[PDB]
């Protein structure tokens, strides 16, 4: 079949969109007349000399903004700001209409946004500079739809989702072909957890433009992850890597996480698990050879090194991630969780419980941190406090499928005794969740259910005990066999009771 | 090991929030949208010549509903004869 790459959609497009759009050489006419100068951006282009030459020859503003775009691609944000500022000082823009000045103000707005994205710091200052530039652009020329797009992005960054949605509604009323409006709307809906609507918007953006930056296929893979169709997510991520082989390490990170999930939930045997896990580790290490300071990769590797009893290096990586990425609360919660897990081996119950509490306060979505907090409460013999905390968590999260939480609730209620019906409900839910997940059901839950049903229904208790015995197989103990024999004795099954006693 | 099993069940669900860096949209990223002031309109009208047919088959497979039938005609007003 036809190869799926960037060259495919290049050949689909006309040669005007193939060669001209990716030119690294800029043609600049001179003020003397027909004379022109061609400067290749592959070489080290000086910002000051190029700006002085452009100002002297008074070239068209398109060349200035194109050079600014190329220096953005080079990462020279300060150089691009210098280009924009000296362009505002140039004679051409001063003698042009306010539309050109508004476009360059919007370019400075995008420069502030790119600096904020590339640094993830000084958010308030860059946001104020971008807001002032966008306000100046809107005052000079309010008819530009790019000003509305910038207003919507500014609202989205400040979490003013309603106003940005209204702006995108106005843009859609103006024209339905705006790809950036669709991408911004999908970003807002994804932020509002409207995954399906953002998925249709991502599909529309992909159909309109398969070569649009940012990549819609990342959002399509995220939506497929939300809809459990992770195979199509991995396929779309591979296609994205084919289209964008550079500066797209996040796609490789998502592919590694999906591979880890597939290894965890699909490995049919220990050897296959070992092979898939080692392949995931090798792929993660290969991704690490490009960037060795990415905090998420260190957090992922911390799990493997914790499983390797390398607690000291886990502590070092966690402290490094805390020092670098203290702004992100999820990394703080994960680092606190791993520190608590490390201290659990040391049995620092108070310290581990405090770390779990800090992880919970940092990110409330970390269910594992709260379950570890409950486990630490059990460790400090705080049975009542753990029970109250577990009841609060269950009542707040009745839809959460935390099977181990329900198993622990059933065991605690069986120990209490008076709440036996809640124990029955939680153990039945645990059994159902384990059956749906195709996970080995713990026979201890069956033993607890039989003990509870002893005072309610001997038949159900005997059936659960038989199921537990079948699960154990050769691991049957003297207590289980004796209780089976007594059950058959009460059932007047003399032969079966005699066999179980034997 | 119970917490290890819980970690295996949860995996990296809540760690995908930071991975939303690709959702951010910036005008300067696209190479050919800026080369002329009206290059945005030129690129918007460059893909009207393309359609679903021009899409790669694997990317067409990615378009999954969350074939035409011969007996559903599109309505007309003048007919023929």
């Amino acid at each position: 079949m036809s190869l799926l790459d960037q060259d495919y959609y290049l050949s689909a497009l006309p040669e005007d969109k193939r060669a001209e759009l990716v030119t690294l050489q800029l043609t600049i006419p001179l003020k003397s007349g027909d004379e022109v100068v061609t400067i290749d951006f592959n070489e080290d282009v000086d910002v000051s000399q190029l700006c002085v030459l452009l100002e002297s020859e008074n070239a068209r503003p398109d060349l200035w903004l194109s050079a600014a775009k190329v220096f953005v691609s080079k990462g020279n944000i300060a150089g691009s700001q210098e280009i924009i500022r000296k362009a505002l000082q140039s004679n051409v823009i001063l003698d042009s209409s306010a539309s050109v000045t508004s476009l360059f103000h919007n370019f400075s707005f995008w420069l502030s946004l790119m600096e904020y994205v590339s640094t993830n710091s000084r958010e308030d200052q860059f946001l104020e500079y971008a807001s002032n530039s966008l306000q100046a652009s809107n005052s000079l020329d309010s008819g530009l739809i790019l000003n509305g797009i910038g207003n919507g992005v500014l609202y989205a960054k400040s979490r003013r989702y309603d106003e940005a949605l209204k702006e995108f509604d106005n843009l859609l009323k103006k024209k339905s072909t705006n790809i950036l409006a669709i991408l911004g709307k999908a970003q807002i809906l994804y932020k509002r957890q409207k995954y399906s609507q953002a998925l249709e918007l991502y599909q529309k953006a992909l159909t309109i433009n398969p070569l649009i930056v940012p990549d819609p296929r990342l959002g399509i893979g995220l939506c497929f992850w939300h809809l459990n169709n992770k195979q199509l997510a991995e396929q779309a991520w591979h296609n994205s890597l084919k289209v964008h082989p550079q500066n797209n390490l996040n796609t490789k990170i998502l592919i590694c996480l999906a591979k880890f999930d597939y290894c965890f939930n699909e490995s049919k045997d220990d050897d296959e698990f070992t092979a898939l896990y080692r392949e995931s580790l090798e792929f993660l290490h290969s991704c690490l050879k490009e960037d060795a300071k990415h905090p998420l990769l260190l957090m992922v590797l911390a799990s493997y090194y914790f499983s390797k009893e390398d607690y000291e290096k886990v502590e070092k990586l966690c402290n490094l991630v805390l020092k670098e990425n203290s702004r992100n609360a999820a990394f703080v919660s994960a680092s606190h969780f791993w520190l608590a897990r490390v201290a659990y081996h040391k049995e620092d119950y108070v310290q581990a419980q405090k770390q779990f509490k800090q992880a919970e306060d940092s990110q409330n979505s970390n269910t594992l941190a709260k379950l570890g907090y409950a486990q630490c409460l059990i460790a400090r013999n705080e049975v009542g406090d753990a029970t109250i905390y577990l009841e609060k968590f269950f009542k707040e999260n009745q839809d959460s499928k935390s099977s181990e939480m329900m198993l622990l609730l059933g065991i605690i209620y069986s120990q209490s005794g008076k709440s036996y019906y809640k124990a029955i409900i939680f153990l039945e839910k645990y059994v159902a969740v384990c059956q749906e997940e195709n996970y080995p059901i713990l026979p201890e839950a069956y033993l607890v259910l039989s003990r509870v049903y002893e005072n309610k229904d001997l038949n159900v208790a005997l059936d659960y005990l038989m199921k537990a015995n079948d699960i154990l197989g050769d691991k049957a103990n003297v207590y289980v066999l004796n209780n089976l024999g007594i059950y058959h004795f009460f059932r007047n099954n003399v032969s079966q009771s005699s066999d179980f006693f034997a | 090991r119970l917490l290890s099993a819980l970690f295996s069940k949860d995996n990296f669900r809540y760690l995908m929030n930071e991975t939303s860096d690709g959702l951010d949209v910036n005008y300067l990223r696209i190479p050919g949208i800026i080369e002329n002031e009206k290059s945005l309109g030129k690129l918007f009208s460059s893909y009207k010549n393309l359609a679903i047919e021009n899409l790669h088959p694997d990317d067409r497979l990615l378009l999954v509903d969350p074939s035409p039938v011969f007996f559903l005609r599109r309505p007309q007003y003048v007919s023929d004869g």
Binding site: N438, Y439 | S4
Partner: peptide
């Protein structure tokens, strides 16, 4: 038989022991 075959040590809780049997060297800065 795939339902019973998938039930193994890592599902039973020996996941840490299985990972401990997998040795690999990384280029760690720390």
């Amino acid at each position: 038989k795939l339902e019973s075959m998938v039930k193994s040590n890592y599902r039973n809780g020996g996941l840490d022991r299985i990972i401990s049997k997998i040795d690999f060297d990384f280029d760690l800065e720390l």
